[PDB]
Amino acid sequence: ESQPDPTPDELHKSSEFTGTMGNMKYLYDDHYVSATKVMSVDKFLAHDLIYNISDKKLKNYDKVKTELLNEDLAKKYKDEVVDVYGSNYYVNCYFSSKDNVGKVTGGKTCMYGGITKHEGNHFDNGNLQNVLIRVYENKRNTISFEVQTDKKSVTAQELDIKARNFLINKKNLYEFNSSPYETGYIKFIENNGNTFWYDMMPAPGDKFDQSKYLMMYNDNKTVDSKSVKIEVHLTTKN
């Protein structure tokens, strides 16, 4: 059911990552795909969905492929009108898409999960929900800040992205060469008592695989924005 807290020895240490921390920072520093009321237009593999989504800013892509945990999830959202929000990558992003006139199999950008039904998923009076993030540095709550979302059921991915974007800016969570923190995990606590956490640091070694890291979001896990509680736990060292 609930996921047990990290054992001391299982959390990734920034000390053991000899690659460039900027590759991790890239995924969260004002970086995300956002789309409203779209419907998939194609598939590549059985568990993914392809959408016609182009970025106004920079014009880096016109097609987005999102991979889900399995075929049932893909099937569930295939013909649904959804909203999209997630962290995209280009390295090792593959797909032969159903490209309209202007393009030919436009394999532009990739991501995982990040899908929520549009209909009935928004607050009345067009209000935004504020979600509080409490951050602990070396076991002490140093700061707390709020992120906002207009979705009632929001992906954990969306809140994680917003939380890290703020921390990168205010706490230098990730820098180009390294990070001022040794370990770090973001923990979600749901209203029914269920808990889960994501390790915020890259796996040991000299290489960082963006697609491998973001794959954790393929479960398309959603939480109730009005009741979730989020805690960021960081230890200093680096």
Which one among 64, 67, 77, 83 touches Zn ion, defined by CB under 5 A? 83
Q: How far is the CB of 74 from Zn ion (least distance, A)?
A: 20
Nearest approach in angstroms of CB 48 to Zn ion is 21
Query: What stretch of H or E contains 231?
Result: strand 229-236
Task: State the DSSP code for 2.
Answer: P
Residue 157 DSSP SS3? helix
Interface stretch with Zn ion, choices 79-87, 132-140, 200-208, 212-220 (CB under 5 A): 79-87
Residue 93 near residue 86, CB atoms below 8 Å: no
Nearer to Zn ion, 35 or 111 (CB): 35
Site string for Zn ion, 112-151 (x = CB under 5 A): ------x---------------------------------
Burial of residue 119 (CB within 10 Å: 0-12, 13-18, 19+) is exposed
Residue number with CB closer to Zn ion (83 or 231):
83
71 is known to lie in a ligand binding site: yes
How far are the Cα atoms of 61, 118, 133, 209 from residue 37, in angstroms, in the given order? Answer: 18, 6, 28, 31
Mask: binding to Zn ion, 167-196, rule CB under 5 A, as x and -? ------------------------------
Strand ranges (DSSP E) for 95-169?
Answer: 109-112, 115-117, 129-137, 140-149, 153-155
Residue nearest to Zn ion (CB): 118
Q: C-beta of 12: minimal distance to Zn ion in Å?
A: 34
Ramachandran angles phi, psi of 99, nearest 5°: -85, 125
Q: Is 224 known as a binding-site position?
A: no
3-state secondary structure of 97: coil
As measured in angstroms, the least distance from the Cβ of 124 to Zn ion is 13
User: Does 150 carry a binding-site annotation?
Assistant: no
Say whether 42 counts as a known binding-site residue.
no
> CB of residue 33 vs Zn ion: minimum separation in angstroms?
15
| Site membership for Zn ion, residue 152 (CB under 5 A) | no
**CB 175 within 8 Å of CB 21:** yes
Shortest distance, position 47 Cβ to Zn ion, whole Å:
23
Task: Specify whether the CB–CB gap between 21 and 174 falls below 8 A.
Answer: yes
- Token pair listed for 195: 């808990």
Q: Rounded to whole angstroms, how far apart are CA atoms 29 and 168?
A: 7
Going by the annotation, the residues of the binding site are: 9, 47, 71, 80, 83, 118-119, 122
Binding residues vs Zn ion (CB under 5 A): 83, 118
Residue list, annotated binding site for Zn(2+)? 9, 47, 71, 80, 83, 118-119, 122
